């Protein structure tokens, strides 16, 4: 399956995760894929909050599925 990600710029980044993988595993890909730190990363699907405990197959995520990459709270 080849999912995608929509950043703040809207840019669409293709991913090659699995329906058995996890969200935290997807973002991890967004880290290098884009080269951005997970400190300010948050993958969202169908405009819904995602968890590192959930799964794609559990989120109904499939192939060609586009996610949402937004920012998060400050750091400190």
What does this 3D model show about the protein?
The chain has 76 residues and is α+β, with helices and mostly antiparallel strands. The chain has one domain: Phosphatidylinositol 3-kinase Catalytic Subunit, Chain A, domain 1 (Ubiquitin-like (UB roll)). Helices cover 21% and strands 22% of the residues. It is globular. The termini are far apart.
Defining key terms:
Ubiquitin-like (UB roll); 2 helices; 22% strand
The backbone outline, from C-alpha atoms, is globular
- Helical segment count: 2
The CATH class is identified as Alpha Beta
Strand content: 15-25%
Order of helices and strands: EEHEHE
Extended strand count: 4
- Report the sheet with the most strands, covering strand number, pairing sense and barrel closure: 4 strands, mixed
Distance between the termini: 37 Å
* Number of structurally distinct domains: 1
Question: What is the second-level CATH architecture?
Answer: Roll
CATH topology: Ubiquitin-like (UB roll)
Task: State the strand order across the main sheet.
Answer: 2-1-4-3
Could you tell me the radius of gyration in angstroms?
11 Å
CATH homologous superfamily label: Phosphatidylinositol 3-kinase Catalytic Subunit, Chain A, domain 1
Question: What is the share of helical residues?
Answer: 10-25%
Protein name: Ubiquitin
Organism: Bos taurus (Bovine)
Subcellular location: Cytoplasm; Nucleus
């Amino acid at each position: 399956m080849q999912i995608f990600v929509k950043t703040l710029t809207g840019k669409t980044i293709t991913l090659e995760v699995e329906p058995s993988d996890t969200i935290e595993n997807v973002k991890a890909k967004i880290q290098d894929k884009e080269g951005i730190p997970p400190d300010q990363q948050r993958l969202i699907f169908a405009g819904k909050q995602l968890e590192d405990g959930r799964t794609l197959s559990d989120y109904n995520i499939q192939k060609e599925s586009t996610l949402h990459l937004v920012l998060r709270l400050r750091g400190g």
